[PDB]
Amino acid sequence: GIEYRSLHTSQLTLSEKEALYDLLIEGFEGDFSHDDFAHTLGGMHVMAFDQQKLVGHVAIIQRHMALDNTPISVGYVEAMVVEQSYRRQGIGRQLMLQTNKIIASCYQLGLLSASDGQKLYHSVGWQIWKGKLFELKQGSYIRSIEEEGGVMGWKADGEVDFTASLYCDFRGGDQW
Amino acid sequence: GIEYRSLHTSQLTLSEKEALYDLLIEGFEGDFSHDDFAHTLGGMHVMAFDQQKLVGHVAIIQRHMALDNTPISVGYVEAMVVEQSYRRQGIGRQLMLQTNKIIASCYQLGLLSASGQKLYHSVGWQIWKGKLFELKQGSYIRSIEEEGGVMGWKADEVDFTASLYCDFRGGDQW
Ligand SMILES: CC(C)(COP(=O)(O)OP(=O)(O)OC[C@H]1O[C@@H](n2cnc3c(N)ncnc32)[C@H](O)[C@@H]1OP(=O)(O)O)[C@@H](O)C(=O)NCCC(=O)NCCS
Ligand SMILES: CC(C)(COP(=O)(O)OP(=O)(O)OC[C@H]1O[C@@H](n2cnc3c(N)ncnc32)[C@H](O)[C@@H]1OP(=O)(O)O)[C@@H](O)C(=O)NCCC(=O)NCCS
Ligand SMILES: CN[C@@H]1[C@@H](O)[C@@H](O[C@@H]2[C@@H](O)[C@H](O[C@H]3OC(CNCCO)=CC[C@H]3NC(C)=O)[C@@H](N)C[C@H]2NC(=O)[C@@H](O)CCN)OC[C@]1(C)O
Ligand SMILES: CN[C@@H]1[C@@H](O)[C@@H](O[C@@H]2[C@@H](O)[C@H](O[C@H]3OC(CNCCO)=CC[C@H]3NC(C)=O)[C@@H](N)C[C@H]2NC(=O)[C@@H](O)CCN)OC[C@]1(C)O
């Protein structure tokens, strides 16, 4: 074998963008919205190819969040997918190892919302976020109760309080 | 010549990041903070080279803002600089032309805070007419100083008279 490429959205060919969309719809068995695809664009993509065919993907989006009262730069992991017949071969793990490298070089903290999918992320050093989660709804921050226990975080240095509150920035669709 | 290269922050070595810092400090005559440099990192860099010598740069950072009540994905332009002896030759214009292409392919709106605005206007950018808000002490406040300084580029429409609420960061919010 599998070839891996790290490409910003601006560096994708039009062909690669359409393959990616198809891969995400197929890999999530349709449970992937237009908002979810919008969240996948604008940052870095790690893509896995079997020769010329796209078979795996993860994206890393820059988000601007607050850790308690402190601003933090976040590499937010979106749209992790491997084509069904290529699964359970370690592609997803390699995508995450490359993801960790990107986060370590650019952002203060990695974050993601898992599935069922937690064991893979835990195997490359990610941990469940234990503090409160907040999102903007109708103007002001509310608790993201549904997501608490599902969001996972990662720091290279490990020097971050996983019990602290996280306030995420405003976007369409699912905030996490 | 001048060669132009577009690299994500994760595609840069330590020396190239250091060359970028030095260019920014020199080009802004020291009026560029450690926070300003943090704002420069994490997105796309358009860089101009005379041979192996970095002589120009602009960054495009993804930001998540609200246009009035609606969320808007923003390519935010940071750290536009050309080395002093290379100015008034078209490099800044070419850096903005590459910037526009990146914004057009990734984001709904391009934004920046200027400091002359003629260059940006020459490449399609327009002064933002709506109120601007930033966070201070956890509550949004009129970015009164910024209003009239922030410019937008439509990635095309977006109503430039709507209120913009920027997302939270260290240092200057705009
Ligand atoms: C989640 C997903 C990307 C995992 O991709 P993957 O390529 O199968 O990932 P890996 O092969 O690295 O790991 C998958 C499993 O096979 C194991 N494995 C690792 N290397 C292996 C190898 N050489 N041979 C066999 N199995 C291996 C892993 O330990 C892991 O075990 P687990 O499921 O019990 O935790 C994939 O299942 C997928 O696309 N799901 C649909 C979309 C989705 O849910 N994305 C995640 C949302 S958070
Ligand atoms: C802002 C900055 C990047 C411009 O870079 P630049 O390479 O000089 O940009 P350009 O050469 O494309 O255009 C600048 C001017 O030179 C003119 N110009 C361009 N090529 C020219 C040429 N061959 N002959 C004569 N004039 C020319 C342009 O018409 C333009 O005129 P204007 O300012 O009245 O609009 C540079 O001044 C700088 O680094 N300033 C320090 C950083 C700063 O203060 N602010 C960051 C911007 S918000
Ligand atoms: C804590 N319980 C969880 C749910 O909460 C829900 O977690 C959602 C989460 O997977 C989504 O991330 C992945 O899934 C898809 C698309 N899938 C939804 C179809 O649009 C996009 C990116 C994926 N991530 C990666 C790394 O690839 C998050 N984007 C949103 C999470 N939240 C919700 O959907 C609800 O709160 C809706 C309220 N607005 O799933 C599983 C769960 C354990 O039961
Ligand atoms: C509208 N009047 C303006 C002021 O408002 C102020 O505009 C600031 C603006 O240039 C800054 O962007 C540029 O400057 C630097 C370095 N900046 C100085 C060292 O930190 C970083 C990136 C630059 N942009 C690009 C595209 O490269 C913005 N980041 C912030 C703007 N606001 C302020 O500085 C003050 O309101 C608060 C400061 N505590 O100066 C210029 C002005 C026209 O007079």
Author numbering:
A (entry chain A): 2 to 116, 118 to 178
B (entry chain B): 2 to 116, 119 to 159, 161 to 178
Give the authors' words.
However, a newly developed aminoglycoside antibiotic, plazomicin (marketed as Zemdri), was approved for clinical use by the U.S. Food and Drug Administration (FDA) in 2018; and since then, sister agencies in other countries have also approved its use. Like other aminoglycosides, plazomicin binds to the 16S rRNA at the aminoacyl-tRNA site (A-site) of the 30S ribosomal subunit, interfering with protein translation. Chemically, plazomicin is derived from sisomicin, an aminoglycoside that closely resembles gentamicin, with synthetic modifications incorporated at the N1 and N6′ positions of the antibiotic. The N1 position is extended by appending a hydroxy-aminobutyric acid (HABA) substituent, and the N6′ is modified through the addition of a hydroxyethyl (HE) substituent.
The high-resolution crystal structure of acetylated-plazomicin and CoA bound to AAC(2′)-Ia from Providencia stuartii was determined at 2.0 Å. Crystals of AAC(2′)-Ia were grown in the presence of the substrates plazomicin and acetyl-CoA. The AAC(2′)-Ia plazomicin binding pocket primarily wraps around the central and prime rings of the aminoglycoside, while the double-prime ring is relatively solvent-exposed. The pattern of hydrogen bonds between AAC(2′)-Ia and acetylated-plazomicin reveals that the majority of interactions occur at the central ring and the prime ring, the latter being the site of 2′-aminoglycoside modification. The Ser114 interacts with the 2′-amine, while residues Ala80 and Met81 interact with the oxygen of the 2′-acetyl modification. The N6′ HE extension sits in a crescent-shaped tunnel of the enzyme and forms a hydrogen bond with residues Asp32 and 37. The structure of the plazomicin enzyme complex shows the reason for this, i.e., the aminoglycoside binding pocket of AAC(2′)-Ia can accommodate both the HABA and HE extensions, while the enzyme remains perfectly poised to modify one of the functional groups on the antibiotic. Modeling of the inactivated plazomicin into the ribosomal A-site reveals that the carbonyl group of the additional acetyl moiety would inevitably cause steric clashes with O6 and/or N7 of G1491.
